[PDB]
């Protein structure tokens, strides 16, 4: 339960480059505090000048008005503006850090956690951090200082009476604590339910074709309501708790007021400046009412931001993709699987004691049933999945010794399920590490794949902004953009995971003919089911439930009368 | 520029079932207004009882404290709580309406607009509507009434002086308007940039494999910063405008105060109850300072919510999927394409004068190059794309005459790019219209596809919660879940758009053997490139750039020595 202090301290580490502007908020809120205590002083002055008859003093009051207010504004702005600067800026730094963390999270994270839930963390939670911090830091400092000024003033004015207020403080302290802990639990619940609403909406957007074909609209609406309504009945409860706590505190303050007043309304009243001194105390006691109601109202906002900071720090403390390395060039591309075993988070054993040695500039074809672990094997080469027992040596170097970005930039991949961005055709080909390729480099790539001619037929050529998943292009078309992207990469190691599955006989013929000219001392791993493209591979690896069955050339395996010979049914 | 009134009125149509609780906020904020005006009255009373020596009257002051505060809280809660109820509830209704609208948006919307941009509309914008409305309605009503009470009180107290305040109002009015219009433009900019940040993050999540393989992290970070920073320098500008407007208004109020005071500090002061009457006016003038600063501070929050309501109403007024119909059963499934033409939003002509007549319980195979318009044609049958010229008659009934949900529920679809949810295996098979299928129905479907045995090998059988895109399953595996889903549907019309492209020779053999038993007077359209599965089709349609080339049986077309004969290379 003490974990709040740990989160508070962590947050403070971020406001180290803001110490300069931090005192600029204290100066500003210190003078606004000075302006509120000066109100009580002015009411005593205006009475004393009317009582002890001093019109000469009263002539100054109009000049004092346009001065107290001017000096308030100048301090109120200095305090308010810099608070926002510190807050909004500090949160911008967190938004960056949280995003950077995300890009460092492994492939399993992305698989286990939906877009909606992930989004709510960087969006809703970091946005809640902004609002809560920019309003709580403002109120807590501005109205906190005001309270401290007026408490000080009441002590200088009459410490005998002000000291009776301190006995009523453990009541308020217990009342604010009970409400605070209740609203924190609710803050946790209001943010989770919000990530749930985000999840429901994001999924509906992704699966719009299934939602439409299978008429799932009523069912999506139902689950949207379910999560939407929980989120509503939770924020309502939080508001009831808030809107009920602040006045109960005001009433337990009024009881301290009346008791202090009944003692101040004891026989000997002719001591203080009749009205002047008496009214000044009552005015400074009332000038305290509003800044305190503000301090109790900010508690909802404060519990909300604490729940969000806890979520942000949790995200930033998640285990991420392990990266410690060296910048090797992969040269030609020798690959060695030494007693490799691949276990998925869920305990599935996709690869079992797989051992294979690929020589540089060799075309090795992975063939087998679905569930053989072909994609699983190839995914290990780019560290999408970490080796759990065994080793992968790329040029006799343990794969994990190579710096992650140095490995990836050297291994070209044509994934089984083609992934495209909502960017131009050119931006999709010259993506990431290829974002410095010239227009001529892009056209060269699209020509190497059978992509150039269809690109030229699109409404805007290479500048046709592709839709959501490039779903404004046909099946085989999206597939050739992915090939163009990998060809442009021109990497020592190439990976073709069902790269032709959506291509017509004339596209498949040109691309395979253009992949004969792409054995430029380039090691390539082909996962194909069309026994025609497999046929010309240097080595054929028959896989079954993460193990090798057979190995060898198209002739060798057909002569063996086994699995490969039987696959020629 | 007047469009704000149109948005305001629209919003009012939502608070028709809240008229009951609406007066409960006026009662509550009316008594809190009565409590603030009673402060000025009490300060006059406390002075008058001290001046005109009435200790008997002063004995009541302690009871009045615990009464004014008690009656404030009871009104402040009644006003504050019901405001939140009305606000949060009204917005919940909008969140539902906005979501319902979304599910009614066409397939092109989903293609043209990214998940991130769409999300920001239902999430960020509807969340901004909540915050802005629940805080502006509260402040505008509570502090609006207070201002009206104190203005009234100052008129009863001294209307000769209070009337001089009205000449200073067109100054404040011009000052608040200039600031208001400036913050509105900024509110527009702060929300758009937020949808941009959402877009960048959502894309990064979807394309994590490309971001990883092509090392696009630095580039994603850059664009995240670019949109993140714009959003920061815009909210900062809005805050500067706010934090500078409120005090300038306070100073132009102080000038009206000093002028009213210099007239009240003219020779004849011995008229009013010396302190009593004078102080009461000054106190009620100062009790006005804070609720007015609140009314000028709420302007930022108000411009933010207006920009969001404008966005929400724009979303709700978008053209949606046209739906006017009749509940026909599609019976056996006769389909007639009459001089059909398909033009995509962007002007591409995917289908040109396509005419074809399918008889019920016939297997018609669509064959041709990529870019033939096979997917385009099949997509029209489920109204994913509307016919632009020509007609589609399903059982001699114009397709648009059939009610949308009635068409879709009767046409089973196995899409080219398989789409799966982050739900259990069973929930993915028995999705939407099939969400009432029993466990035995699900197992029957997965057995009909080659799915049952691999499902049984997964960590949790039919209860294995599938990942993001079902990417915790292999290629051919995800494909068989989609087949299972369509088999479970058991529809009169079946559509197989490259439904076997990821299946091994033994899965492809079982499924095609299990699809021979799925010609139960069922019309099926097969888009295949494996000339083996096409071979047994009743009719073969050779397509090229949205036109038919050749038509006929496997024998007829091979004997024709044309395109189909040439495809047998
Ligand atoms: C300690 C624990 C308990 C707390 C407690 C205390 C007291 C009670 S109670 O039941 O007696 N109640 C209350 C008792 C007292 C008060 N308040 C006051 O006596 C102070 C009111 C006031 O006169 N405030 C003011 C005046 C002049 C200003 N400034 S000025 O004179 O320079 C000026 C400038 C500009 C204008 C207007 C410009 C436009 C024309 C007017 C005046 C400014 C400014 O600038 O902020 C502000 C409030 C209350 C209340 O219940 O709310 C109960 C509980
Ligand atoms: N992330 C994952 N978590 C758990 N199990 C997984 C995951 N990815 C794959 N598997 C399982 O591991 C086995 C082999 O997977 P996979 O490597 O994709 O096979 P494959 O040979 O590429 N098959 P396919 O592409 O369909 O012809 C299958 O039973 C998968 O469901
Ligand atoms: N939403 C869209 N907007 C614009 N053009 C599109 C859209 N969808 C498809 N097209 C284009 O229309 C043509 C035919 O599309 P499509 O119907 O998907 O062909 P296909 O025959 O299924 N090809 P394939 O699946 O790759 O073998 C192609 O040139 C596409 O890029
Ligand atoms: C086109 C469909 C792709 C969607 C990607 C959604 C994001 C899910 C993840 O992590 O990615 C998995 C990949 O590593 C397995 O090959
Ligand atoms: C697995 C990849 C699918 C992603 C769907 C993303 C959402 C994009 C839309 O609208 O959907 C298009 C469909 O209609 C064309 O066949
Ligand atoms: Mg695979
Ligand atoms: Mg297609």
Coordinates of C-alpha atoms and ligand atoms in Angstrom, one line a residue, chain A residues 36 39 42-43 61 64-65 68-69 72 154 165 250 253-254 256-257 282-290, chain B residues 35-36 39 42-43 61 64-66 68-69 72 165 250 253-254 256-257 282-290, ligand 1:
Chain A
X36 CA -5.2 36.1 -0.4
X39 CA -7.5 40.3 1.5
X42 CA -7.4 44.9 3.5
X43 CA -10.9 44.2 5.2
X61 CA -8.2 51.9 -1.4
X64 CA -4.8 49.3 -3.8
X65 CA -7.6 47.5 -5.8
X68 CA -3.7 43.8 -5.4
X69 CA -5.5 42.3 -8.5
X72 CA -2.3 38.6 -8.2
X154 CA -4.5 33.3 11.9
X165 CA -8.1 24.1 15.0
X250 CA -16.5 21.6 5.2
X253 CA -14.5 22.6 9.6
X254 CA -17.7 24.7 10.5
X256 CA -14.2 23.9 14.5
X257 CA -15.3 27.4 13.4
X282 CA -13.5 35.5 10.3
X283 CA -12.6 36.7 6.8
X284 CA -9.2 34.8 6.8
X285 CA -11.1 31.7 8.1
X286 CA -13.6 32.0 5.2
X287 CA -10.8 32.7 2.6
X288 CA -9.6 29.3 3.7
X289 CA -12.9 27.5 2.9
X290 CA -12.6 27.6 -0.9
Chain B
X35 CA -25.3 30.5 0.5
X36 CA -22.7 32.8 -1.3
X39 CA -22.0 35.4 3.1
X42 CA -23.7 37.6 7.4
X43 CA -20.6 39.9 7.3
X61 CA -23.5 33.2 14.8
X64 CA -25.5 30.0 11.8
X65 CA -22.0 28.7 10.8
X66 CA -22.9 25.0 11.2
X68 CA -24.9 28.0 6.3
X69 CA -22.1 25.3 5.6
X72 CA -24.3 24.7 1.2
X165 CA -20.5 47.9 -13.8
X250 CA -9.8 40.4 -13.4
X253 CA -12.9 44.2 -13.2
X254 CA -10.6 45.9 -10.6
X256 CA -14.6 49.0 -12.6
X257 CA -14.2 48.3 -8.8
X282 CA -17.2 45.2 -1.1
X283 CA -17.5 41.6 0.2
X284 CA -20.2 40.7 -2.4
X285 CA -18.0 42.4 -5.1
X286 CA -15.1 40.1 -4.0
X287 CA -17.3 37.0 -3.6
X288 CA -17.9 37.6 -7.3
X289 CA -14.1 37.6 -8.2
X290 CA -13.5 33.8 -7.8
Ligands
LIG1 C1 -11.5 27.5 9.5 C2 -12.4 26.3 9.3 C3 -13.8 26.8 9.0 C4 -13.9 27.7 7.8 C5 -15.1 28.6 7.9 C6 -14.9 29.9 8.0 C7 -16.0 30.8 8.2 C8 -17.3 30.2 8.1 S1 -18.6 31.2 8.1 O1 -19.8 30.5 8.3 O2 -18.4 32.4 8.7 N1 -18.6 31.4 6.4 C9 -17.9 32.4 5.7 C10 -17.2 33.5 6.3 C11 -16.4 34.3 5.5 C12 -16.2 34.0 4.1 N2 -15.4 34.9 3.3 C13 -15.0 36.1 3.6 O3 -15.3 36.6 4.6 C14 -14.2 36.8 2.5 C15 -15.1 37.3 1.4 C16 -14.5 38.5 0.7 O4 -14.8 39.6 0.9 N3 -13.6 38.2 -0.3 C17 -12.9 39.1 -1.1 C18 -13.1 40.5 -0.8 C19 -12.3 41.4 -1.5 C20 -11.3 40.9 -2.5 N4 -10.6 41.8 -3.2 S2 -10.7 43.5 -3.3 O5 -11.3 44.0 -2.1 O6 -9.4 44.0 -3.7 C21 -11.8 43.5 -4.6 C22 -11.3 43.5 -5.9 C23 -12.2 43.4 -7.0 C24 -13.6 43.2 -6.7 C25 -14.6 43.0 -7.8 C26 -14.1 43.5 -9.2 C27 -15.4 43.6 -10.1 C28 -16.2 44.9 -9.8 C29 -14.0 43.3 -5.4 C30 -13.1 43.4 -4.4 C31 -11.2 39.6 -2.7 C32 -10.3 39.0 -3.7 O7 -9.7 39.9 -4.6 O8 -10.0 37.8 -3.9 C33 -11.9 38.6 -2.0 C34 -16.9 33.0 3.5 C35 -17.7 32.1 4.3 C36 -18.2 31.0 3.6 O9 -19.0 30.1 4.3 O10 -18.0 30.7 2.5 C37 -17.5 28.8 8.0 C38 -16.4 28.0 7.9

